[model samples]
Target: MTPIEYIDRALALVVDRLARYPGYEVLLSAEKQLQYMRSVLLDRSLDRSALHRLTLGSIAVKEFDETDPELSRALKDAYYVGIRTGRGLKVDLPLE
Candidate 1:
């Protein structure tokens, strides 16, 4: 898959995982960030810098790290894919 597609999958995964913690403030913020990232992906005018900042901000959500280890790792991996694609680097998405 392409970088954008990979990042999209990652965002979806994190959002789905966060759903388990409905009403929690930290996860809620993380979820919003993920949504923002999605919007950024859809906006052709937005640059990689915008997505880079959002990715870092979402990864820095300490509460998200504390809440789920596996999901946290997945989130990071996905964000990194965004970063890579922004830099014109290539990424190979897993075949399901």
Candidate 2:
């Protein structure tokens, strides 16, 4: 799925359900939103960049926080594309 689709999944599964009450509307604070995004990343297993856009780009953040334990955890489990090397080629090492 694309970034927006991932974000939509995150929102539907987590963000949209936090502290919800009938006949009462409550706005989520920035920290709470951050936690929600982190939940999407950590709990739902999604991309950090997607969460960044979903929270910062779409939500129009005023004071985005810097530190999050979940962020560190997500970084640990992140995947990478093809690894690039200098001198225009990649070198393979032998098990010697």
Candidate 3:
């Protein structure tokens, strides 16, 4: 598919998925939503559609940033929530 085709399809799916989130209306605009969807679609390592599903699922629960936050939060949160939660783990970061 062309870039435009991918993004168009991604937008529809992401918007549908976002409806499950109670406060997603305030989390992002359509323009911003498309950007995140596009990032998941653009990841060649991913299944495109499958990975976008993961993206939608992950973002539904987190406090996302206002700007172009990308998937950084998803990876980190998924690590802790999925891997560390069962272990009752915490990592202290520097207050930079």
Please list the residue runs of candidate 1 whose C-alpha ends up more than 4 Å from where it truly belongs after superposition.
Answer: 47-49, 55-61, 64-67, 85-87, 91-96
Cα error of candidate 2 at position 13, Å: 1.4
Which candidate do you rate higher for lDDT, 1 or 2? 1
* Candidate 2, position 28, lDDT: 47
**Per-residue alpha-carbon lDDT of candidate 1 for residues 23-76, written as tens digits (9 for 90 to 100):** 766556556666666666678676546564564335545645676676677667
Candidate whose TM-score is highest? 1
What TM-score goes with each of the models?
0.59, 0.23, 0.29
Runs of candidate 2 exceeding 4 Å displacement: 19-96
Output the worst ten-in-a-row residue range by lDDT, candidate 3. 77-86
Kindly report which residue pairs in candidate 3 clash with one another.
none
Give Cα distance to truth, residue 81, candidate 3, Å: 30
**Over the full model, what C-alpha lDDT does candidate 2 score relative to the true structure?**
0.34
What digit string (tens of lDDT, one per residue) describes model 3 on residues 15-67? 55466654555335433645644554355463334333334334433534433
Q: Which stretches of candidate 3 lie over 4 Å from their true place?
A: 25-96
lDDT of each: 0.61, 0.34, 0.42
